[model samples]
Target: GTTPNSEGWHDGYYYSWWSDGGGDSTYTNNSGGTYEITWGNGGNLVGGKGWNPGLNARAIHFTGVYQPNGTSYLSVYGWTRNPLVEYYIVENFGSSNPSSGSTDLGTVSCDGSTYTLGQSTRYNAPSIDGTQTFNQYWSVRQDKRSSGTVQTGCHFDAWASAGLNVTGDHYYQIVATEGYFSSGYARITVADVG
Candidate 1:
């Protein structure tokens, strides 16, 4: 069944999906550490989560296919509290680069590739705790990749070093397929790189 704007457990894996537009329907078929989704419409996100309070510390190997027709991002997406931070470790994008023309905060080397670090401050923006001020951290790969083993901890450390400090309680972390004013589809499998 297609689920929209819902988060829960599926086959022992935490599953979530949301869409702002009502016209387009979505699909989901998943198992532990894996998900297959076809999302259509406004601002959509679909993926499997790693419980709550993800450290982004573990090394994870991501394998799958991403086909985002318009504006989309396939990333390691999640949030944090206390300071309220949203973070994206983007691997692939569609239509346009989501990291283009953003404030650059240097770059990091990981998974044998370079990623540009960027930050954005949002004022009274919608968040996990509802509309509030916060910051967004982005690590956009300089080169597009469909699959790679990410050393998530290295990215986190690089963010700290870049002063995009995320000193908040952890939240659910997911390798999510997201779309903005667009539609997309993906079949993903997550595993430990270790």
Candidate 2:
């Protein structure tokens, strides 16, 4: 049992924990590379880690265990300024896929797998900068994996080629887990690849 909402920097990488109702979750980090999260029995929860003002092009190598309950998924989640965009490179999911209702933008490939691209509009939602409206871009993988490497720049470029671009200053890029009307948990690690 932890605080309902706890967000801050742990060893340089930022991590946040939040719930809509009275649910509970825990976030633990070892330096800025390894993270462990176990959350709980009720309410909605979301959490993860990454760089502040994340790079436009990045080679991320990661591995972990993802066990979600009901509606949940894991992704490279973050926000951008100027254009004020939210983005996700969904790697794996739980009972439901988060990108199902989105407008199909196109597809992108990474680590020998194809991920379908999508876009959606979020009106008057809570954001990193503040409460605002923004666009959410998604590149959801056809096959869910708990471990692999992801080239984020390719997905960004693909979105642009498909006419949905996010040209702005990135806030933070994190491998995120989200649960709604359900419970979820995951343990993950993140690293940069040269």
Candidate 3:
């Protein structure tokens, strides 16, 4: 299912055994400005009985504009399970980050505030062409920010400095939440995208 919103924004839903896999529909606002996304209807995840599972239903927003040599911004507000909201800045679709590895890049100033920078990688990610791997450079705030703006592109330089691949064409930006052995809901609204 899907829903449409302001100018170039939409919502979608998906379900799977490992997680409640949901993502954005599509949009074409990559001109470098502000973008907003909101999630509601709360959902949950189900996995094997004995296996510890995670609810990965998240509200994702993407910019059609690629930032190969620039930056973008994101702001969100709402609620969810554990409030484990994250932003994934992706490059080249065929490559993964660097295993289950994540390096803390301390804190940096972006948008109008500060965020903890974490660089990580995911392998064998499911995609239209079988499975693909990718690297994600994230500017995260674990403090459960109910309302704040994130300079989503502020960490690109750090990733490049750390010897990580920040050279591919910008794919899209994602805002999502993950939960462990639990079921909950999300009412997050992401806005102020550039």
lDDT of 3 by residue, 1-194 (tens): 32332211233211112233352222222223322222222332211010012122222332322111112122221111121222343221112222126777676654445555676555786432346554445554434233444443455565456565544432223333323222232333333333
RMSD of 2: 1.6
lDDT of 2 by residue, 1-194 (tens): 66557777887777766667566667677666777777777677778777786887888877888887778888888888889898999988877789889998777787678999999999998887678999999898898898988889888888989987668987888877787766666788887785
Query: Which runs of model 2 end up more than 4 angstroms from their true locations?
Result: none
Residue 186 of model 2, lDDT score: 78
Higher lDDT: candidate 1 or 3? Answer: 1
TM-score of each: 0.90, 0.92, 0.44
User: For candidate 3, what is the lDDT?
Assistant: 0.33
> What TM-score does structure 3 among the candidates reach?
0.44
For all the candidates, what are their Cα RMSDs to the real structure? 2.1, 1.6, 14.2
* Model 3 CA deviation exceeding 4 Å by range: 1-101, 111-114
Backbone steric clashes in candidate 1, count: 2
TM-score between candidate 1 and the true structure: 0.90
